[PDB]
Amino acid sequence: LSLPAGGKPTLAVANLRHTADASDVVLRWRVEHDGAVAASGEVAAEGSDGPLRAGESATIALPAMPAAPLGETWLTVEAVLRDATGWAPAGHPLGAVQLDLSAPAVPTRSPRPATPLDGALPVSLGPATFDAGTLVSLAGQPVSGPRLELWRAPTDNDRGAGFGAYGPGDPWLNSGRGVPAPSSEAVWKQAGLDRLTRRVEDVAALPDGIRVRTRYAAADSTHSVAVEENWQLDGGELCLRIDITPSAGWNLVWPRIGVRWDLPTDVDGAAWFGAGPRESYPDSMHATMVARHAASLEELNVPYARPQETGHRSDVRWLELDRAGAPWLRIDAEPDAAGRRPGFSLARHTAQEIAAAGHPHELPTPSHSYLYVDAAQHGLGSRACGPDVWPDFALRPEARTLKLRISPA
Amino acid sequence: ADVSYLTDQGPGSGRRVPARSWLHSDAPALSLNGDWRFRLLPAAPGTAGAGSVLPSGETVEGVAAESYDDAAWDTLPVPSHWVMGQDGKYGRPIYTNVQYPFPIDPPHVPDANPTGDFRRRFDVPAQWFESTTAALTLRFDGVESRYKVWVNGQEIGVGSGSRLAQEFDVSDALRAGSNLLVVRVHQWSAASYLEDQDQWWLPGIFRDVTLQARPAGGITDAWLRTGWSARSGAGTGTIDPEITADATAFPVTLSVPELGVNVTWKSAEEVAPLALENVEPWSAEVPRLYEASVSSAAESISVRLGFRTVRIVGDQFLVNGRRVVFHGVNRHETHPDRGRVFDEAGAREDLALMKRFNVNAIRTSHYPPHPRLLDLADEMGFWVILECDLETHGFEAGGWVENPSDVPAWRDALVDRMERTVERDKNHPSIVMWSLGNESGTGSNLAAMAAWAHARDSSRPVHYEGDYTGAYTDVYSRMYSSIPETDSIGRNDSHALLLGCDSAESARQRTKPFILCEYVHAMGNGPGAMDQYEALVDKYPRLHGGFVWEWRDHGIRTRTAEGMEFFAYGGDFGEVVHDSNFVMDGMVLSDSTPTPGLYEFKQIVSPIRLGLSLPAGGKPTLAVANLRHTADASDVVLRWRVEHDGAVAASGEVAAEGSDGPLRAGESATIALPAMPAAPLGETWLTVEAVLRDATGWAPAGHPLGAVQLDLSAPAVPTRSPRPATPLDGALPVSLGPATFDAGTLVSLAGQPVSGPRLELWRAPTDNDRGAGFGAYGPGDPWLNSGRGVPAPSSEAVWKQAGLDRLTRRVEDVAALPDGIRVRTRYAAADSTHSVAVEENWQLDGGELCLRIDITPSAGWNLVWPRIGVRWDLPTDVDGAAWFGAGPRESYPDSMHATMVARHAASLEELNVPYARPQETGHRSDVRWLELDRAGAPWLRIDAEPDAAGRRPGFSLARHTAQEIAAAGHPHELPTPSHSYLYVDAAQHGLGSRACGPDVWPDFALRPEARTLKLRISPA
Amino acid sequence: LPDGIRVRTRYAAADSTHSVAVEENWQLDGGELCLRIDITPSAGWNLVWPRIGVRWDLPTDVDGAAWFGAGPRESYPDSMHATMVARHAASLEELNVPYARPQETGHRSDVRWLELDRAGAPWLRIDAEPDAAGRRPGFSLARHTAQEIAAAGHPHELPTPSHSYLYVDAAQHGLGSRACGPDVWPDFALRPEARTLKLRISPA
Ligand SMILES: [Cl-]
Ligand SMILES: [Cl-]
Ligand SMILES: [Mg+2]
Ligand code: NA
Ligand code: NA
């Protein structure tokens, strides 16, 4: 899909089949405004002489689709089978593509950075309650956090060491076999990434807010990550900026950069606008659409035979957490200076507990639900048997900012 | 008395006022500039190693007291540096590049710590104490380094951040009538660790000291954040105002008369964004400003609005929706008499000179300039990278251990520096990037500066070249990356590792816009490669150009013990540690003379790119491309001329037009010029220049932007050389036309005593010839090892080891020819097994004196040669030359773009460039003929024939040998001339930039070869 | 201090991260002036050191010395065989060798005590106590500093003297023959170490 300067949305179609023409296929399109269908239709897959032949390409101009003045406008086109076969229903999708047609972004105006004040800390800020600067509840429910996390429950590929690692050299050298190296899990454990400790440097009032500065580091390590939270009320909304600024020494792939919130166990589902419906990671984004999505815990997370990282939803505009069936908390996320959006995961156990379990049935009975809001996740690759994560999708140490607005749903 | 303030790592102390803009306000104000009472102490009072620094009976901070008697004290101008303009009375400047001039022991500084006490009386109007005034503010725009302030004996506070503004609240200390201000300034402090810029160390109160009376219900700060997007017609402007003021200030009115805006806000809550139709955008090419004011009943602020929007989209740096290519320079305030003290008239002229050489951007290396400079950049049109005052480069050698950038004790200080940088200058449209500082490694504190800037100002990206892995910056910035590495950065099919990065970090840096924050190091004779870097920018959209290091030489005017004036550099002031002439690394000399390297820059970065060709049977065809960011080419005229052996035969003008009127930015066109038939004899050259039709604030009408030539000459007629002759027995000739010989030795030419020719391989080494940072390019494929070369000594080291500066001449034989003479000689250094054979065949051929010189090296020579040429020793009254060839300025194999083939003429002072350290200069290339003059009167002509390969020689004329020049550290150290020396060079080595940057690119490097000169010599 | 003074100083070159801490304890003990100097280098020093000592700046009329220790001529760790322990005396001219190129010369080793004279008249006496390892200091008396000497190509290029300089060295580097031959044999080469000087200073 493309939008030629001055034109209409233009659909390129290539029939990549070996023999069959595209007569069994119909192309269905929809335009959605913030996830809701505003217009839709369907076109036949035709070439220069009837149905698009095996090995033939064509282009089709679709109807004009003016951008909605506010919010986001997305075009999706899906190739589907017209008729049922012995193995699929009529309307079975073969594959899809999207085109962002959104009107120019209206950035939210963030609160000005504020000088800390002497004096008492606020007890409540909108839906948040604090005890001596420690978050204790959000929107009527007990909640702890945010807590920096770098650890993720290692994937099978994070545990692999057959192929070499791509980090240390040009990946095009050595026949693309990488540089002999320990597994990612081995280096992460050796760095103590699974056992970071939190130390409070200082807590201070802001005008209509609170600033908390913390420093995270593993026992027996010289490396650290400073974290600063600025909670501010801005026009009745609770704004939270979190700046994460690592020390200089860090020289390994990081599994993730995010913060964890500890929630009641009855927080059991989420809705979001962003990539979905399933989990996605930097080198695994093709089967995603930007739309409105919703899932319970069991739909969010894949029950892989060995418990590991699962369930990350990328490129999130907003999420809404459901509790005992009903909407409870809304988090809006603003893109950072580089236009990057965070992701989230919702889990019944911490990444440390998951990493410890050999099978799902070996996990303890849950005491919390955990929300991870991730600025970044490492790619997946296939190093259990095959190439490491391709360098473009590999996470190395970096400073990140999360810009959140938190409200009762 | 507590002197812990001297080593404190915090931002400063006392009655500090929150950082805000430098604003043009009508609030009552007065300047405290003038001649203050001053004394210099050798140490900081009250420190452990300063037990008896003060006069008997004076207490550590007694100087502050209103009762203190300073009647006998000298006075010192404020603003100034105490080490400048005083004949050394209070010490001298100290130059270091990277090394700190004190032990690396943070936060401690030496006991020998020049400390200046300043005392000033001044009057404050009684009116300033009326209820119409809410507060009284004392402002320091610049003090090096840390200082403590007392007013009427009360301690007010301590400042840090030498090039950053600091305001203090003196409301409670001042009185109506006469007041006292005392400032104690230390040269060294904990702040000096944060200020290791490559420049002179210059203590003192070097920017303005002022008082302002803050109006009750005034506006403390405003930020009129502007934006622009394209429409039909002019386009749409936006203002997103931020007003910092008390509730009593409202109503506040924003007025922009030209745009018809007059908006009154009745409370803080009404202050809101506005969109304005028919707004012309601001850019460096077209710096359109709109006058505006923001006022309450009590105070009016005048702003000039430039509407422009900066956006990064993937790897593109856009302003107003179009990619910006930076043709910039690194600049800081510099003056041989005044140091870093600002002078508006001088600054305007400086920026005008930049514009005349096609500079469109300035990086403020490596701290904010005087705030007034930014008004000039807004008005004259430069893209600006405004850089915070931070450089900890000296921590590198010890592996960055204790680097303030990653030490928590310094964090508050570093973030405060960024806050003061951003707040002062946030209103200026010329600023399109904030920079965190320079060469300070990496660390959590640098990332915290970036996080603060991002939180405060989303309108401008964050630049910092020490962020090699791209952990917290929005652009990828490098300094002196080679051509191979820069190519690797710009291209989309390379996963090669970049400096300091693993493969993932290298990939992420390639996702951002790229700039060279420093490149083509301009020190001495050079740089080469500017064309190679520009060709990468042409080729790869990710590459956005760069900033030359640097604009000006920083020479300090001083006198020898005998009273001879000169520009001093590092070490000339008796420094213990110093970095010599590395402070002399500008495109412009200390007296403001543009060097040949600046003319080369100008041509290469011309906004109107010209090409010439002659299609078979067609007419001369001119290709024209408008490479500008926004402006069409209506201001430009294309002037052509054809010259027959240098003399104009025909000329004309052509408009730069595209498909629809004037050639638009980004548009290309071709135009057939008139037919220009070749002269049947001699050479015919077409020159086309792009010139400004009309005058600007900074240039006259007809100011050239760039040029191109095309050779249209008739096929060459090769001259008939005398047949090689067999030598005869018997008497040598004495007289061969204009030459006279004594027993085969030349003694005169055309009535004047002359010696020669003498083979010469030595040249007086350029600063680049003396560099050894990057490796040399000879021993390997230059595209390997990221273009970093092979580690190796400097060219000068290998030349001296080989004895190239001390070749000896041995005559093998001398023989008569029929109407001539043959001389065979052999050249070699003492203790060397290598040699060069030289044969001279002088022959009269139809009454013309022909000289063929064949230079045939032995086999074992394995190093670069500086030159291959012959030297002639002439009378000192030989003092000018005319030639037909490349000119009018010196040129070298990797620096030929700003030359034209034509007839040129120059005296000795015009021929040779007075570089701060004497070195190779003055070579004129591609010479057809040269004529030497004796005080304007033509004396000797030499015609040169091209060799078998079509190569033409060049020449230089000098007052001293290459050997004497090489031995002199400054021009004034050269002896009184006893000869003029003509060097006729078959070859010269290229320039490169190895003093800091790549070696000479291999295509332009001189390696041992045999060469022939074919000359005809006649009286002129 | 009770009947004394303690001075703590730190020595380091510009642009260096290394340093040497020095503590002086001056204490009157039974009418005698005792001075203990403890020299304690930082960790990273990784090169041979020329000497470890202290310099005193004196009037130019201090122009001779008597001592009890090794003599009568200069001696260094790898050049001790022609010394005898005895009472010796020398003028400046007899103390220092005029080598064609001015360099280190004049070090007297294994000193129990030294007396400085002004025109033959004894002025100052310094007694040195052996350190914990039994090591004794040495001394040199010079008309110029080691820096000034290093800078001069010939004796006649030195400036008119403005002081006499006494160096009391805990250690000197050996001599070897590296201008053409083996380096100093390791047994005699000086590497960074902490040293103490224990002195008693009196009028002679
Ligand atoms: Cl913890
Ligand atoms: Cl000779
Ligand atoms: Mg130059
Ligand atoms: Na410096
Ligand atoms: Na420099």
Automatic annotation (TrEMBL), chain C:
Protein name: Beta-galactosidase
Highest taxon of source: Bacteria
Residues of the full protein shown: 820 to 1023 of 1023
Limits of the Beta galactosidase small chain/ domain: 1-202
Family that this chain belongs to: Belongs to the glycosyl hydrolase 2 family.
